[PDB]
Each structure stands twice: as structure tokens, then as C-alpha cells.
């Protein structure tokens, strides 16, 4: 029965996600023309930029 | 805390370029005005006098 260890393997699951997610959600557009801040800083003038 | 007052001609076409944040050839090589500029800009033809 190789499912007897059920939470010891989903805490290491859940936090796995938990981290994959939070390193996936920083190449999301949050209201920005791109995800990278070099692109915001290069292309657009600062005021916009900021 | 500190007024300063400065004064200097123009052209009218010239005017626009008088903004925090904005470029041309009066506004990066002349009068560079800061993006967090808090004030008023006092602007009046002398065409009569100049």
C-alpha cells in the first residue's frame, strides 16, 4: 500500500504547490504592460514606470 | 517651509514643455522639473514689452 503515508506526503505536496505558486505568480501582469521590471523600466518613462 | 521663485522668457510654443515629467528640447536641456514637483507655474504672454 504505497498510499499509507497520506499526510506525510501531502504536507510535502502542499508545500511544493504552495511554492511552485508563489514563483509562478511573478509572471503574472498585475495591471503592468509586462511581468519583467527591467522591460517596465527600459521601455516606459519613469513616471509611468513607477 | 521654502518658496523659491524663478523667472525666464519662453516661447509660446515652448509652454507645454513646462510639466513634472515631461521631455524636449526646454525640458532636458534647459528646465528639468523634478516627477514629485509640488507647485504652481505662472505663465503670461509679453508680447507687448519683450
Do not use: M
Request: aromatic share 8%.
Amino acid at each position: 500500500t504505497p498510499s499509507a503515508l497520506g499526510k506525510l506526503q501531502d504536507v510535502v505536496n502542499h508545500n511544493a504547490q504552495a511554492l511552485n505558486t508563489l514563483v509562478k505568480q511573478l509572471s503574472s501582469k498585475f495591471g503592468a504592460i509586462s511581468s519583467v521590471l527591467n522591460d517596465i523600466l527600459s521601455r516606459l518613462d519613469p513616471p509611468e514606470a513607477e | 517651509t521654502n518658496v523659491y521663485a524663478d523667472s525666464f522668457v519662453i516661447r509660446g510654443n515652448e509652454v507645454s514643455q513646462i510639466a513634472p515629467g515631461q521631455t524636449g528640447n526646454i525640458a532636458d536641456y534647459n528646465y528639468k522639473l523634478p516627477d514629485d514637483f509640488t507647485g504652481c507655474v505662472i505663465a503670461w504672454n509679453s508680447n507687448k514689452l519683450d
